[PDB]
Antibody, heavy 220, light 214 residues
């Protein structure tokens, strides 16, 4: 019955400040401490601090002192966390969780994703990846698609309008100088390409763009 | 601060087998430790508390043990649904700290990577750039190393890598490596090579090409 509904994703520029919320329901809000946790690939899960809704008393991890500020609104059974002087290092997923003195963090919020960037919304450049000299060895050939320089995530990618689903690998986007870059691989029989056309279809909702890029065999 | 150490970032297993994940606290915390399970894109889920008690609803195949500094989360009759990451946490004293996590992945027979290399496209060159791409597909185990060489010399600046998670169909892994240079930089050299070293072979898998030569 206990539930923790967190606010949606946040996308801001460095130096800004954000106030995330965690709405508690299904239990007596003032009876348990509310904890906040940061999660990043490089730093794993880090405890930020805790607050006792009963009187607002707070405890902080020295690492986040001055960065996060915990507060609550008793009447609305809501917990809040403000993060200030934001930098790219604050980009992560932040969870609220109900603390039990002896039972640990029994219930967690779904998490709120925070992205702090100097970048602006930008459609990607879609480049074809055709094997060198259009060669191949076995009975298969691998082609690719390079989706470079877009912001923010995500992009949707299919091969031949999705008709080619097997033999496809789309790699996780990687950040680079404020923008994202992603690539996708597709393997077909050599009797399929270049005999038939293979096209990469790429959409970037945030910029309302949709692009199709045909993979052409080429010579020097 | 109390440091929680999960020596194993990854552990291989198979459906039906039993696995034990280790976690050690830098100081005595008695039985005040919990274990959480997390699947990609989701929040952690409480599994074990006070070192050995299961939360309500948790499967009986999950058991915890240990007291003091050394702890263990053991999963018996591992199920596909159990494939995820597990973190230990001490909630004895502030600051509360977590372990770095241990990922559970499916065991399978070793597989050599299929390597493909691609030159920068005419489209990108026109925009003053040049990315050389290398795909290392469907290999196992996950550990692999790639090196870029330009005219025989290894190159490290300008390289960006991306790894997929274990494939749900063949339990293999794939990787993409991209070397990005300026157009002028790219046209200053002739030989480009992608080299991968994997457990499956004592010698590197090499894929090369010479600019403007077929």
């Amino acid at each position: 019955q206990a539930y923790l509904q967190e606010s949606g994703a946040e996308l801001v520029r460095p130096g800004a400040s954000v106030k995330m919320s965690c709405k508690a329901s299904g239990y007596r809000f003032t009876s348990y401490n509310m904890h906040w946790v940061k999660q990043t690939p490089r730093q794993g899960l880090e405890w930020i601090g805790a607050i006792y809704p009963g009187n607002g008393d707070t405890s902080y991890n020295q690492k986040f002192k001055g960065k996060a500020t915990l507060t609550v609104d008793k009447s609305s059974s809501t917990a809040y966390m403000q993060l200030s002087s934001l930098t790219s290092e604050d980009s992560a997923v932040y969870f609220c969780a109900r603390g039990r003195l002896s039972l640990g963090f029994d219930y967690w919020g779904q998490g709120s994703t925070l992205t702090v960037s100097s970048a602006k919304t930008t459609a990607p450049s879609v480049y074809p990846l055709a094997p060198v000299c259009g060669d191949t060895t076995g009975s298969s050939v691998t082609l690719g698609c390079l989706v470079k320089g877009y912001f923010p995530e995500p992009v949707t990618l299919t091969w031949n309008s999705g008709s080619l689903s097997s033999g496809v690998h789309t790699f996780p986007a990687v950040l680079q100088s404020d923008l994202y870059t992603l690539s996708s691989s597709v393997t077909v029989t050599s009797s399929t390409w270049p005999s038939q056309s293979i096209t990469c279809n790429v959409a970037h909702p945030a910029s309302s763009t949709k692009v199709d890029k045909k993979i052409e065999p080429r010579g020097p | 601060d109390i440091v929680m150490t999960q020596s194993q970032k990854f552990m291989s297993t198979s459906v039906g087998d039993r696995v034990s994940i280790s976690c050690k606290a830098s100081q005595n915390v008695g039985n005040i430790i919990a274990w959480y399970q997390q699947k990609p894109g989701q929040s952690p889920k409480a599994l074990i508390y006070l070192a050995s008690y299961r939360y309500s609803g948790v499967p009986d195949r999950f058991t915890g043990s240990g007291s003091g500094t050394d702890f263990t989360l053991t999963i018996s009759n591992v199920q596909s649904e159990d494939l995820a990451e597990y973190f230990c946490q001490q909630y004895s004293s502030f600051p509360l700290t977590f372990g770095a996590g241990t990922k559970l992945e499916l065991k399978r027979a070793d597989a050599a990577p299929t390597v493909s290399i691609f030159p920068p496209s005419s489209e990108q060159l026109t925009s003053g750039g040049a990315s050389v791409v290398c795909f290392l597909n469907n290999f196992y185990p996950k550990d692999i190393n790639v090196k870029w060489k330009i005219d025989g010399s290894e190159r490290q600046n300008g390289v960006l890598n991306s790894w997929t998670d274990q494939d749900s169909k063949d339990s293999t892994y794939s990787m993409s490596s991209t070397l990005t240079l300026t157009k002028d930089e790219y046209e200053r050299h002739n030989s480009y090579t992608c080299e991968a070293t994997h457990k499956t072979s004592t010698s590197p898998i090499v894929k090369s090409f010479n600019r403007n030569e077929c």
